[PDB]
Design a protein around this ligand. Structure first.
Ligand SMILES: Nc1ncnc2c1ncn2[C@@H]1O[C@H](COP(=O)(O)OP(=O)(O)OP(=O)(O)O)[C@@H](O)[C@H]1O
Ligand SMILES: Nc1ncnc2c1ncn2[C@@H]1O[C@H](COP(=O)(O)OP(=O)(O)O)[C@@H](O)[C@H]1O
Ligand SMILES: [Mg+2]
Ligand SMILES: [Mg+2]
Lengths: 136, 829, 264, 371, 373
């Protein structure tokens, strides 16, 4: 927000931010440049750094759907020595909010899991346990 | 002050003691029972000034009065209990230990452990003060020992029991008490006898240890101690059992590696395979197999062993040949072999003699097939120097190589009688070094008659004496002594003080190496030899005669003989070399012998200065520690050329087969510095060769088996080399420089092929780390420091041991080294 | 000379080439506080025996906590006058970084003179300047006033009959090591306001100027009630300013009234 | 047997060295002249204007030396140097011309040690500790006899306890027992308090903690007395507010120092806490801290003992009876008893009578009682 | 007896040492050369041929090459007896001599003392088979950390990615640090322990640097095993709220993550993350693209307790016979650290009984005491 007055180091970050702003909003066409920014704390960011001559076209990364999870796991399995029997779509269904690289990590863990015994096939349930009383 | 409870307890105890003046009702049995109850309370309680004691001081005398007062009966020992406890705390050195213990035999329940400790001490010191008499009072000492030892073995104090037995001279007592739990503890303790006070009297320690080992059927280490005790008959007896094929083959492997020659024929099971194992026929194949594993069969140019890029007379030509031979040990240089062979053949000049042919012999060391074949197809013809090169190459190939076939012996006996003096010398040297340490009699009978060298040179006499010394290797062969005597008769007034005269003393010492009390007869022969001689080589006789001793009576004798100033310092040189040849085992003693040798070099004559570095090498052979390397470089850059020569070669030796980067860098810097010194450059080249021995695969070492076994042939060769280098200027920088080939024959590896049953190269993960001196420490000490799991084909190091793994296999030996077998019988995965 | 007459801090000449030393170069109303301090300071000084039967030590350190202008001055004056023992004063930041390295040596000479003038009263006003609470950086790793504090504590502990009077405006900042046993131990606070105290301080600090009679300094003290200490000194100085402005050296009640009005 | 080995070789040393060295000394020459020659040759090796700072060491004979002007220059060392004293950050000596490393000299360190080690042997000894025999014996077992008799543990197998907590109400002789341990033990005790490690800024606290631990390990195998830590951390909270997050980091660094990945020397930790239930459950982990000791309020007999030991250096009067003070069956720590004694003495002094009185001790009781 | 003999002989040794010192006389005072001789004339001559300064080369402009050098004096130089022009590198430490400034010797990169001694090249004294109660966890760790290194052709044949990143978590004290030490000792690769506290410094700029130099050091080394401890200290929840002043730690954590896996390969570095509160860990770091095989240490079962008991009983002076499974039964819900402390208590009880045997009775007493406290 650039107005918080906590302590030092803050103000240094604000000069660096303002230098960024200058570098593309000043008396300079800056024609031969292409800035692409990447952030995760979407909400908390400088209102001026924000956009409209600075960071426009703010593409958004959503949570992958079932299809997206199926596609990502397929992509990571392309080089995997998968046997000719896969429920990729149903594994995507099992994902249940498995958005991030977790798909890649799971394909790797499945490789290691099969490698326990030296195999090339998908159990499809040891795959969930790689994924990761009372009633039931 | 005191607490009221305390003061009351004392008051009662005294009042009891004063009323004790005779035996009556409560007085004798119940009052003394009260006293023993308080004694039991005191032992059970803390070592915190027990209340009953430290206040009943006159009461000790009063209890003594009551003891001599009451008539004999149920009393006289039940009160002796109290009297002996008050003794332990105050008095009664032996009287109580005797009578009170005659009462209430053992069963020290109401006394704790300090009581047992001090009774043990008193009994041991009573035996010490009792000379060879008092048999009537010694039988009670035997009963005391019987009482005490089993309780000690039970509790935890096996070290204290071992003490008791050593200072009571009861070596053959515990044989009836040792247990399946404590056998390792007691055997380790017995092995740890660097004082070995009984040993000069007799090897009683080894006797009892061997008895225990044969009782518990631990044949490998039983045989190790059998070799330690110099009795080939005892070694054969231990080996005889052969109850297990696996252990039989394992102990055959140890016998072969140590080079001890077994004696039998087609008369027992596994005779052929045991014979091959001992003969070491498979050593070359196994070595080549390990080399293939992580293949290292790449010949390297002298400069490549060096790094000359970082920046040709006979001298540097032969130096480079020596470096190549050192670095490429039994690797079959082949193409580079032929290249360097042609090079030095063209450079045949002055000393471009058989030396390089013997070098080829080293490159083909232990390569009976390849070495013999290559030399046969390309060698011989004219140039009697080249024919002697063939002879010495055969000798090197057969060095430490046992086989009924006599590829070296036959040839060298055939050409022994040739008139050519130098070629005959080379032939005899090859014959000696081909079977150095074999100790048989055929070559001795063939050589001793031709000892007489009036028709030949004194160097030939000396080298023939060294050949016989290699063969005898401490046997004290009377024939060797006699032939040495006729050599002395043939001796001349001046030939002694010219050069090489030390060889005959060297051979005599080889024949009578570290024998023991026979050193007395050795000195007797030393006085018998009243030649017009400046002693010195007589001192060498005595030195090389006595060796392997951890005590310092001979050490102080030698130190003082050298200390008397010689304003003829070669005498002091041999004296210091003998100090080294006595101190070679115990680590602290070796370290501090190096400290003393540094003192000698700093506050010594130039003679002693030239002498010290050789002794430093003796102490630290193949053990390049930073401090010793610093010192050796320090006194290798010395102004005196002889000092520099001794120090540079000593540094090469301490770096022998280690390839340490720091050592090599220092070596090349020193070579750069000595750019204008031809002999120094030669010696530095040989120093790099030593640093790179077999590319760091073969390491000569006197010690062996976790610093337990003495390498007789290795010590023989090393002492020959170091005696030769005592005077580097004349002995080596001249005609003779093949004592390095003698050392080569003395070479040996450091390696851990786990060739399992039927020599199957079963691999296994082994955790290797610097030794920790397991003795005394807590529990089962982690002998491995810096665990470096590196499969089976490892090389260990100068002082690191292995622990294998959790339970994968069961090794046949706990001292893993060389050829080993791993029973594939884990108790449970 | 072999540094025969050179402490390791002095100027010395060095040759240009082949550096070499040569030709060494040379260099009212405060009754309760008055009492409390009088006992705590003199009783140990006058009658050391009063602790032998007690089997305890003589108290050897007091610390005053005063307002800015009130206290720390009149009591020091009273102690100096009514106590025959030497009254040395090192008041103010007499060890501030103004002079480092030699600050420790000045502490050495202070201890030397304190020992020589035994018993001695080492008055030290406003230790806060030199005596700030031991915290932040350094903590003994710094060669600054923190190092000086460490040296002072080491030297202190031991005093036999010398006495030390620390003083500060604020108790908030303090050093645990210094306040620990064997060092400055007792404390006492000061009350800022008092009519008699204000009037007497007024007279004392108006002493060094040409005052005129027919003037009620009592009235002036009363009419400056909400007044601190050094505030009174400022009042007097501005009264002198108004006296000059009137163009006459007859410092008058008119001038004091105007100065008090301007001050308040 | 081991005794035999050591005795044999030791006699060997005495004989070898003494006899040979004395022979050479009897022929003293050939030593002093060489020594003087060598010393003057070292002096000849340039000793002009010279100093150096060691940034680091490459290897034997080669290292980087920086000067105040930043003269970082790399130089080949001169073997004349003492060697092995070349710790990075050491003050080296450099030739004016070639900047040859020829000497090193610091002889001055951060006075942190002199600040945190004051009165290593305070006036309070175990005699001055009246009572608490069980706690005294347990702390001795934990601390001293491991150091004064490093034989029993070595022969039996275990290593001694590392951290020992002493927990109890506000004032039960915790610092007193720490002081007595310091005085009785030859090791360089270290006093530490919980109100100084709370530094103004991030990393400062953990930095000084690590430096304190390293100092403890280096200068002496001794005790480190960590006073109240409940003002620090108090377990690992949700870690929301920055100050408490940093303090939690400081405790985690403390925990690593107490038992970390690498190792730990022969430095024992002694904690003193007013309240223990609130401390980090993980910090007291039995692997790290063991022998937590109750330090409760003294009972009636302990109060008698404490009064007696406090007043040993107090000539009590014939009429003064130290039983009306034991009468009070309420909170009276050792500090409370000391305060009572001091107040009685001071009031007697004020009322001018050289001898203390029962009424004076009574009034001291009322005026020392807080509640 | 024996003790008095010791005291006598050590007295003899002390006398001998002081006699040597006084007789001969060796000391240093200020600087020294105790090792005899040390003459270094040739060393002086080559020092003159050397004693060069060093700086950081910047760019080799032309294809005779133009090296650019920066320190208290800028320079543009090139050429030397040295070869491998700029060792195919620019930002090295050049090490150039004076006197026309064209002769060079490459040098490694400068690194701050913190990381220099954090290298922790020492080998902790622990080995496998000394671990009980976490056989499954140690199996997982062994697999992940060794199969990629030990005979890993089998690990590549399957066409499976090599896992990289493991986070050990569990109750406070379960043998996690013990297993980390064991892996460190057994492994043969550039091992680097890391302490979280050393990454917290005075205001922004310090942690990010030291992290970046650490990472480039690991990359330069052939293959690295990094061993972060105190991850709970370093890196937390990204939320600011009042941490707007405390954002320094969050910044350092962000740079850490970027080096772990950003817009560049991270390299053959395997990361171990020690912790005991695996919930406040930041989601970005906990992303399984950086911590693949999180391992959980739980309280040992009866068999694990017994195995740890015998492991600690490895020490000597213990009873001839103990019944460890009952020992474990008597101590349920007990950490392996508590087993260690029970063995310690048994030893201390033996000492406080003046007994050189640690009996099952001693073990029972120790168990009772620890349970009661
Ligand atoms: N599986 C085990 N085998 C042997 N000892 C174990 C085992 N688990 C724990 N211990 C014992 O517990 C202690 C190990 O503490 P360590 O520092 O390794 O634990 P941690 O899990 O990293 O957690 P913490 O740091 O909270 O103690 C040592 O006493 C070790 O003997
Ligand atoms: N045996 C004792 N137990 C407890 N306190 C004692 C003992 N002997 C003396 N004291 C008094 O206790 C005081 C110290 O208590 P302290 O260690 O400061 O408690 P805490 O550290 O909990 O505040 C000293 O003033 C001392 O006079
Ligand atoms: Mg306290
Ligand atoms: Mg841990």
């Amino acid at each position: 927000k650039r107005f918080d007055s906590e302590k030092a180091g803050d103000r240094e970050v604000q000069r660096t931010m303002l230098e960024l702003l200058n570098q593309l909003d000043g008396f300079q066409p800056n024609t031969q440049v292409k800035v692409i920014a990447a952030t995760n704390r979407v909400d908390i960011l400088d209102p001026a750094l924000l956009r409209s001559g600075r960071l426009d076209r703010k593409i958004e990364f959503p949570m992958p759907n079932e299809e997206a999870r199926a596609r990502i796991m397929q992509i990571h399995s392309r080089k995997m020595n998968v046997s000719p029997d896969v429920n990729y779509e149903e594994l995507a269904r099992c994902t249940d909010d498995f958005n991030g690289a977790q798909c890649k990590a799971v394909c790797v863990e499945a490789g290691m899991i099969a490698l326990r015994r030296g195999a090339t096939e998908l159990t499809h349930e040891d795959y969930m346990e790689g994924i990761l009383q009372y009633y039931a | 002050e005191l607490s009221e409870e305390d003061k009351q307890l004392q008051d009662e105890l005294e009042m009891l003691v004063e009323r004790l003046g005779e035996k009556d009702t409560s007085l004798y049995r119940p009052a003394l029972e009260e006293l023993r109850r308080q004694i039991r309370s005191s032992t059970t309680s803390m070592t915190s000034v027990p209340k009953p004691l430290k206040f009943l001081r006159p009461h000790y005398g009063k209890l003594k009065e009551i003891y001599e007062n009451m008539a004999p009966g149920e009393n006289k020992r039940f009160a002796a209990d109290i009297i002996s406890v008050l003794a332990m705390t105050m008095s009664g050195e032996r009287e109580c230990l005797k009578y009170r213990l005659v009462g209430s035999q053992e069963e020290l329940a109401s006394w704790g452990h300090e009581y047992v400790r001090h009774l043990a001490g008193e009994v041991a010191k009573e035996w010490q003060e009792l000379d060879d008499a008092e048999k009537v009072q010694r039988e009670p000492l035997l009963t005391l020992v019987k009482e005490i030892v089993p309780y000690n073995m039970a509790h935890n104090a096996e070290h204290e029991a071992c003490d008791l037995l050593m200072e009571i001279e009861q070596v053959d007592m515990l044989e009836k008490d040792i247990d399946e739990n404590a056998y390792a503890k007691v055997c380790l303790y017995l092995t740890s006898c660097v004082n070995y006070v009984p040993e000069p009297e007799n090897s009683a320690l080894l006797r009892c240890a061997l008895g225990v080992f044969r009782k518990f059927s631990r044949f490998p280490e039983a045989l190790r101690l059998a070799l330690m005790l110099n009795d080939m008959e005892l070694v054969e007896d231990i080996f005889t059992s052969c109850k297990d094929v696996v252990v039989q083959k394992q102990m055959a492997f140890m016998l072969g590696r140590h080079g001890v020659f077994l004696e039998l024929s087609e008369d027992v099971e596994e005779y052929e395979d045991l014979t091959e194992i001992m003969s070491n026929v498979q050593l070359n194949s196994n070595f080549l197999a390990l080399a293939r594993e992580l293949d290292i069969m790449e010949p390297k140019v002298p400069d490549d062993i060096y790094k000359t890029h970082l920046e040709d007379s006979a001298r540097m030509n032969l130096a480079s040949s020596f470096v190549n031979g050192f670095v490429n040990a039994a690797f079959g240089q082949d193409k580079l072999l032929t290249d360097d062979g042609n090079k030095w053949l063209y450079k045949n000049k002055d000393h471009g003699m058989l030396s390089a042919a013997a070098s080829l012999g080293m490159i083909l060391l232990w390569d009976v097939d390849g070495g013999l074949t290559q030399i046969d197809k390309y060698l011989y013809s004219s140039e009697d120097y080249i024919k002697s090169g063939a002879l010495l190459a055969c000798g090197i190939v057969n060095s430490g190589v046992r086989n009924e076939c006599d590829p070296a012996l036959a040839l060298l006996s055939d050409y022994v009688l040739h008139n050519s003096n130098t070629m005959r010398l080379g032939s005899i040297f090859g014959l000696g070094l081909a079977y150095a340490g074999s100790n048989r009699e055929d070559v001795l009978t063939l050589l001793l008659p031709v000892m007489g060298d009036s028709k030949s040179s004194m160097e030939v006499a000396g080298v023939t004496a060294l050949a016989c010394g290699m063969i005898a290797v401490g046997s004290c062969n009377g024939d060797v002594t006699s032939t040495i005597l006729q050599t002395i008769m043939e001796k001349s007034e001046t030939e002694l003080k010219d050069t090489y005269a030390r060889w005959l003393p060297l051979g005599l010492g080889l024949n009578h190496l570290g024998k023991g009390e026979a050193i007395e007869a050795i000195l007797a022969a030393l006085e018998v030899v009243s030649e017009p001689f400046r002693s010195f080589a007589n001192t060498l006789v005595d030195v090389c005669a006595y060796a392997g001793s951890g005590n310092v009576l001979k050490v102080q004798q030698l130190l003082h003989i050298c200390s008397e100033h010689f304003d003829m310092g070669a005498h002091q040189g041999v004296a210091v070399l003998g100090i080294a040849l006595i101190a070679m085992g115990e680590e602290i003693g070796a370290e501090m012998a190096l400290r003393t040798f540094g003192h000698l070099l700093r506050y010594g004559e130039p003679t002693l200065r030239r002498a010290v570095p050789l002794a430093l090498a003796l102490i630290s052979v193949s053990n390049p520690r930073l401090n010793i390397l610093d010192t050796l470089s320090k006194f290798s850059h010395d102004a005196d050329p002889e000092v520099s020569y001794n120090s540079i070669f000593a540094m090469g030796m301490v770096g022998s087969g280690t390839n340490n980067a720091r050592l090599a860098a220092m070596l090349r810097q020193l070579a750069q510095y000595h750019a204008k010194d031809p002999n120094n450059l030669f010696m530095v080249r040989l120093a790099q060769g030593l640093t790179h021995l077999g590319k760091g695969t073969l390491t000569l070492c006197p010690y062996h088996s976790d610093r337990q076994l003495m390498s007789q042939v290795a010590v023989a060769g090393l002492l020959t080399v170091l005696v030769s280098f005592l005077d580097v200027r004349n002995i080596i920088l001249g005609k003779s420089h093949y004592v390095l080939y003698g050392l080569v024959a003395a070479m040996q590896p450091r390696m851990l092929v786990t060739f399992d049953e039927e020599l199957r190269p079963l691999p296994v993960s082994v955790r290797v780390g610097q030794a920790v001196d397991v003795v005394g420490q807590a529990g089962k000490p982690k002998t491995i420091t810096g665990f470096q799991t590196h499969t089976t084909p490892v090389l260990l190091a100068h002082g690191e041991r292995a622990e294998l793994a959790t339970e994968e296999f069961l090794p046949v030996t706990p001292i893993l080294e060389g050829f080993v077998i791993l029973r594939k019988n884990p108790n449970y995965d | 000379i072999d540094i025969n007459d050179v402490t390791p801090n002095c100027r010395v000449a060095l040759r240009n080439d082949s550096y070499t030393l040569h030709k060494i170069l040379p260099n009212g109303g405060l009754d309760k506080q008055i009492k409390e301090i009088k006992e705590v300071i003199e009783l140990p000084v006058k009658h050391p025996e009063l602790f032998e039967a007690l089997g305890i030590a003589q108290p050897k350190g007091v610390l005053l906590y005063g307002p800015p202008g009130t206290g720390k001055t009149l009591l020091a004056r009273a102690v100096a006058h009514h106590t025959d023992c030497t009254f040395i004063r090192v008041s103010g930041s007499e060890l501030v970084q103004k002079f480092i390295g030699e600050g420790a040596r000045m502490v050495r000479e202070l201890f030397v003179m304190a020992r020589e003038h035994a018993p001695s009263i080492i008055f030290m006003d406003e230790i806060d300047s030199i005596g700030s609470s031991r915290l932040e950086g350094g903590s003994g790793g710094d060669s600054e006033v923190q190092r000086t504090m460490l040296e002072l504590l080491n030297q202190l502990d031991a005093t036999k009959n010398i006495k030390v009077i620390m003083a500060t405006n604020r108790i908030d900042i303090l050093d645990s090591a210094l306040l620990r046993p064997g060092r400055i131990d007792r404390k006492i606070e000061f009350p800022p306001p008092n009519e008699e105290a204000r009037l007497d301080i007024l007279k004392i600090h108006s002493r060094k100027m040409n005052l005129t009679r027919g003037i009620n300094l009592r009235k002036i003290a009363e009419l400056m009630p909400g007044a601190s200490g050094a505030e009174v000194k400022g009042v007097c100085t501005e009264a002198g300013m108004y006296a000059l402005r009137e163009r006459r050296v007859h410092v008058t009640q008119e001038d004091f009234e105007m100065a008090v009005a301007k001050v308040m | 047997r081991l005794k035999l080995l050591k005795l044999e070789r030791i006699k060997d040393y005495l004989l070898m060295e003494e006899e040979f060295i004395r022979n050479q000394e009897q022929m003293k020459p050939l030593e002093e002249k060489q020594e003087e020659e060598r010393s003057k040759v070292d002096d000849l090796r340039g000793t002009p204007m010279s100093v150096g700072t060691l940034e680091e060491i490459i290897d034997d004979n080669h290292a980087i030396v920086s000067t105040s002007v930043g003269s970082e220059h790399y130089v080949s060392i001169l073997s004349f140097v003492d060697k092995d004293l070349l710790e990075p950050g050491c003050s080296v000596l450099l030739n004016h011309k070639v900047h040859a490393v020829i000497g090193v000299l610091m002889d001055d360190t951060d006075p942190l040690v002199t600040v945190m080690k004051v009165e290593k042997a305070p006036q309070e000894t175990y005699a001055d500790i009246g009572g608490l025999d069980n706690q005294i014996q347990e702390i001795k077992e934990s601390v001293e006899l491991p150091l004064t008799h490093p034989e029993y543990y070595e022969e039996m197998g275990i290593k001694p306890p590392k951290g020992v907590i002493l927990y109890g109400p506000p004032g039960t002789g915790k610092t007193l027992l720490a002081k007595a341990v310091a005085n009785q033990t030859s090791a360089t005790f270290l006093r530490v308090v919980g109100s100084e490690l709370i530094q103004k800024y991030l990393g400062d606290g953990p930095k000084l903690v690590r430096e304190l631990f390293r100092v403890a390990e280096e200068h002496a195998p001794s005790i480190v007395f960590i006073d109240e830590i409940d003002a620090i951390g108090t377990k690992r909270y949700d870690s929301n507010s920055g100050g408490e997050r940093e303090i939690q980091r400081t405790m985690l660094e403390l925990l690593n120092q107490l038992d970390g990945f690498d190792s730990r020397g022969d430095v024992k930790v002694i904690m003193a806490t007013n309240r223990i239930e609130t401390l980090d459950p993980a910090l007291i982990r039995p692997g790290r801290i063991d022998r937590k000791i109750e330090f409760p309020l003294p009972d009636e007999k302990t109060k008698k003992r404490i009064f007696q030991i406090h007043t040993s250096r107090m000539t009590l009067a014939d009429d003064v009876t130290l039983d009306d003070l034991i009468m009070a069956k309420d909170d009276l720590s050792g500090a409370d008893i000391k305060a009572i004694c001091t107040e009685a003495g001071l009031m007697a002094l004020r009322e001018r009578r050289m001898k203390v009185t029962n009424e004076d001790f009574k009034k001291s009781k009322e005026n020392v009682l807080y509640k | 007896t024996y003790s008095r003999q010791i005291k006598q002989v050590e007295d003899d040794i002390q006398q001998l040492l002081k006699k040597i010192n006084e007789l001969t006389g060796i000391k240093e005072s200020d600087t020294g050369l105790a090792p005899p001789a040390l003459w270094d004339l040739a060393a002086d001559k080559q020092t003159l041929q050397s004693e060069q300064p060093l700086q950081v080369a910047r760019c080799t402009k032309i294809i005779k090459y133009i090296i650019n050098v920066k320190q208290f004096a800028k320079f543009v130089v090139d050429l030397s007896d040295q070869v491998a022009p700029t060792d195919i590198e620019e930002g090295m430490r050049v090490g150039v001599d004076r006197n026309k400034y064209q002769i060079h010797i490459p040098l490694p990169p400068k690194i701050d003392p913190t990381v220099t001694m954090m290298q922790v090249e020492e080998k902790p004294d622990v080995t496998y088979s000394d671990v009980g109660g976490c056989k499954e966890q140690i199996e997982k760790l062994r697999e992940v950390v060794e199969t990629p290194l030990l005979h890993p052709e089998r690990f590549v044949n399957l066409g499976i990615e090599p896992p990289k990143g493991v986070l050990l978590f569990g109750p406070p004290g379960t043998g996690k640090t013990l297993c980390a030490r064991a892996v460190a000792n057994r492994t043969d690769a550039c091992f680097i322990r890391v302490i979280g506290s050393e990454l917290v410094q005075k205001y922004v700029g310090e942690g990010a640097r030291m992290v970046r130099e650490l990472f480039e050091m690991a990359r330069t080394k052939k293959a690295c095993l990094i061993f972060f401890d105190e991850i709970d200290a370093i890196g937390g929840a990204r939320f600011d709220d009042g941490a707007g002043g405390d954002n320094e730690v969050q910044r350092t954590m962000l740079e850490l993550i970027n080096q772990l896996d950003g817009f560049d390969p991270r390299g053959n570095i395997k990361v171990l993350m020690a912790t005991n509160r695996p919930d406040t860990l930041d989601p970005a770091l906990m992303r399984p693209g950086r911590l693949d095989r999180k391992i959980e240490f739980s309280l040992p079962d009866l068999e694990g307790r017994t195995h740890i008991f015998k492991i600690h009983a490895r020490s000597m002076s213990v009873e001839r016979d103990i019944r460890f499974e009952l020992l474990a039964r008597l101590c349920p819900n007990s950490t392996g650290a508590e087993i260690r402390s029970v063995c310690t208590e048994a030893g201390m009880f033996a000492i406080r009984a003046r007994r050189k045997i640690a009996t099952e009775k001693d073990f029972l007493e120790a168990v009772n005491k620890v349970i009661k406290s």
